[PDB]
Design a protein around this ligand. Structure first.
Ligand SMILES: [Mg+2]
Ligand SMILES: [Mg+2]
Ligand SMILES: [Zn+2]
Length: 712
RNA sequence: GAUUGCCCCUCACGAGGGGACAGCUGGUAAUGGGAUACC
DNA sequence: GTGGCGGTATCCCATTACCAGCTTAACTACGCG
DNA sequence: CGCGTAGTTATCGACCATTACCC
């Protein structure tokens, strides 16, 4: 880090009037050009307390290219530069200055021997050069901050510990980012991003002969300064029989009816009575669809690319920052002129300008004593809603809305409403877990179809009688009568088989064993636990031939790697976690009738909130796969922390030490009050839903005050 | 009442209803599932 | 800063978490029509 | 002379807090 001259003049005149980037860039030029005295007159008027420093992304689709990416001089030049910089040492990088001018660019390209495959744009190269130099220095800073963070952690532990006891670790070994020879161990990989820049920025398609479009875009005309018409008609009940987009009679009116072929009672909600509904357009053929696109081009040389900007139009008509009449050029001016083309997916990611859209993004969620002090400011003027969130698996989210107001030197926190998210979102959570299991079973059932006809028959036969074979084999080997022993009440930790075994009392050798102590933090004398029925069931299932198993599982791996479903589900769970924090926020906002909602979530370390899958106890279900039951705690924890930056929300991370335990009424925190989802204090006998009422009541009370919950 | 795409559901396959919209890379690390092996 | 899955060692696959990198543009200049 | 292509040259700043919490 090196001080700048510009920083001095601002710090000397504007201590606390930080400005956003666009004014900073323009302001720097004026100072350097028109002297130091002329920058104040530009920077005195316009400034903001919290300047928007975040731009949402918008994604569109590539239509056609001149040739495949990575066949372009910029893409080859970027790769050649990148893999040269990542294999430099620390000392060599210090004497590697690729300066920002055209003259120095060539001096660099010659002094090192790296080639540029016919591409030299000073700005475009400068973008690549800084980003590559940035990544190389980033992996070196990253260790240093982590090294600093451990040192800071050690620093606290010694001073605090050294007064209560003697033991204190003196120090620890420095973690380096370098090899013995100076090189970079685990150096960054190249990035395949076509970073578009100003001299190349997208602009509305006009027909040039080098650019040739697929046969569907036969005549593409679009006056870039005309207002783009609206696709759908205003009343979709005029569309006739033939034309596309025809809503049939039975589907307009709400009600229930039976289809003519089979007959099922299906509720039809009818046309949506909504005013911000996205409109879906339908063309007769794929040629009409193309002529109603928004094509803009990006030319860098003898190789171009055409992209379809309907994606940006939807993303702008959803945020309602685009008038109903708008031109193609106006749409492009709503976004920055530097897209990021994704070459391996043919997707271009625009972002909004700070003027068109853009919000402040708080870097961190406030914790500790910042919670009280933040409410001290925000309640000085208006009242702020306070939703307290407590995650679980019986009830995914439990929320309590309060209404903090301020009287002199206190924050009256009115409790308003405790609720949980509705059954529809619970139904989708259940349906998401069923879809995952269905996906897994289909992949398994299609890996069987990848076997040759001989091994296929073996697998089909064995799986059908797998449970029957194990049952009969176990009984015959140890003589146990199947009927005397209950089967359906078999779990992962029951010991029914052994007790029937021990009732015969053949020997004690075969059952008891000496569990090897698990490598871990905790070591004791090793327990002698008797082996369970799940272990017996596993060890007696009929194993499949090694060769067929190698072939069968290799087929599954191939199907699994190239399966579109896991992306489908991973987005599905994320959007279902986000949908469940929007209900929460919108419900509290329509109830508290306040603009500003600051949700309060527990400071749970998501690494240990993952959960597990589930098998129903039983003998039949030892040989089936585990139904997936992973927790949404990580999803919903991240979704609230994302409200912090995506929508500039305040977020409160507060330690949930005794929140689920400490009785609301009294300060007595014994661990035995909680029993699951039935709380009961053991001094002032009281019954509340541990999740809904005591956990949220206590979370809010540790929010209004920085102090952590009292202990004894 | 917003032209593509993406996610979920219904469908008389004409379509209808609802949902997400901060995303890319890269290096590491966990987590869950599946298979074998062994005390 | 993991719990009631009996422990460990190989792999295989998926998705996350965590922390690095990113996600302009006005003004000016010069070779062609 | 005007317009498509393109080089120069401008800014990058911070946080709390430690024996439970969900199965
Ligand atoms: Mg809790
Ligand atoms: Mg709870
Ligand atoms: Zn009590």
């Amino acid at each position: 880090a090196v001080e700048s001259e510009f920083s001095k003049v601002l710090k000397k005149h504007f201590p606390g009037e930080r400005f956003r980037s666009s004014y900073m860039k323009r302001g720097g030029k004026i100072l350097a050009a028109q002297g130091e005295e002329a920058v104040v007159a530009y920077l005195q008027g316009k400034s903001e307390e919290e300047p928007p420093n975040f731009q949402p992304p918008a994604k569109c689709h590539v239509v056609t290219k001149s040739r495949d990416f990575a066949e372009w001089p910029i893409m080859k030049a970027s790769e050649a530069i990148q893999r040269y910089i990542y294999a430099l040492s620390t000392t060599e990088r210090a004497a590697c200055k690729p300066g920002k001018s055209s003259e120095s660019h060539a001096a660099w390209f010659a002094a090192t021997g790296v080639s540029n495959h016919g591409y030299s744009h000073v700005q475009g190269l400068n973008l690549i050069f800084d980003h590559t130099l940035g990544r190389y220095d980033g992996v070196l800073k990253k260790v240093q901050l982590r090294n600093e963070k451990a040192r800071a952690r050690l620093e606290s532990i010694n001073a605090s510990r050294a007064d209560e006891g003697l033991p204190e670790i003196k120090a620890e070994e420095e973690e380096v980012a370098t090899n013995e020879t100076g090189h970079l161990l685990q150096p960054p990989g190249i990035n395949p991003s076509f970073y578009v820049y100003q001299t190349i920025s997208p602009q509305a398609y006009r027909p040039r002969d080098e650019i040739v479009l697929p046969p569907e875009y036969a005549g593409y005309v679009r006056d870039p300064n005309a207002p783009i018409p609206l696709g759908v008609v205003r009343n979709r009940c005029d569309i006739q029989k033939g034309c596309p987009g025809y809503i049939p009679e039975w589907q307009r009116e709400a009600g229930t009816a039976i289809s003519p072929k089979t007959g099922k009672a299906v509720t039809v909600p009818g046309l949506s009575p909504k005013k911000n509904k996205r409109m879906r357009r339908y063309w007769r053929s794929e040629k009409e669809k193309a002529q109603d696109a928004l094509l803009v081009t990006v030319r860098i040389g003898t190789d171009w690319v055409v992209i379809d900007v309907r994606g940006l139009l939807r993303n702008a008509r959803w945020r309602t920052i685009a008038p109903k009449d708008i031109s193609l050029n106006a749409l492009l001016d709503l976004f920055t002129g530097d897209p990021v083309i994704d070459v391996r997916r043919n997707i271009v990611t625009f972002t909004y300008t700070l003027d068109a859209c853009g919000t402040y993004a708080r870097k961190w969620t406030l914790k500790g004593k910042q919670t009280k002090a933040t409410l001290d400011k925000l309640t000085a003027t208006q009242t702020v809603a306070l939703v307290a969130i407590d995650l679980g698996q019986t009830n995914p989210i439990s929320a309590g809305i309060s209404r903090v107001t301020q009287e002199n030197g206190a924050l009256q926190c009115e409790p308003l409403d405790r609720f949980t998210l509705p059954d529809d979102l619970l139904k989708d959570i259940s349906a998401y877990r069923i879809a995952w299991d269905r996906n897994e079973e289909e992949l398994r059932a299609r890996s069987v179809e990848a076997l040759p006809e001989a091994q296929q028959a073996e697998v089909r036969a064995l799986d059908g009688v797998s449970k029957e074979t194990a049952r009969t084999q176990l009984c015959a080997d140890f003589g146990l009568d199947p009927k005397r022993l209950p089967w359906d009440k078999m779990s992962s930790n029951t010991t029914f088989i052994s007790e029937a075994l021990l009732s015969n009392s053949v020997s004690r050798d075969q059952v008891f064993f000496t569990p090897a102590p698990k490598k871990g933090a905790k070591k004791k004398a090793p327990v002698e636990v008797m082996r369970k029925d799940r272990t017996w069931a596993r060890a007696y299932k009929p194993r499949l031939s090694v060769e067929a198993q190698k072939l069968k599982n290799e087929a599954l791996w191939a199907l699994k790697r190239t399966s579109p479903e896991y992306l489908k589900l991973s987005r599905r769970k994320e959007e279902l976690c986000r949908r469940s924090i929007n209900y929460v926020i919108e419900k509290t906002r329509r109830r508290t009738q306040c603009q500003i909602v600051i949700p309060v979530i527990e400071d749970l370390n998501v690494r240990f909130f993952h959960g597990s899958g589930k098998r129903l106890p039983g003998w039949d279900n030892f040989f089936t796969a585990k139904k997936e039951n992973r927790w949404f705690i990580q999803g919903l924890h991240k979704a609230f922390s994302d409200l912090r930056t995506h929508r500039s929300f305040y977020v409160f991370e507060v330690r949930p030490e005794r929140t689920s335990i400490t009785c609301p009424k009294c300060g007595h925190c014994e661990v035995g009050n909680r029993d699951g989802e039935a709380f009961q204090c053991l001094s002032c006998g009281k019954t509340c839903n541990a999740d809904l009422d005591v956990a949220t009541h206590n979370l809010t009370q540790v929010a209004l005050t920085g102090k952590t919950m009292p202990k004894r």
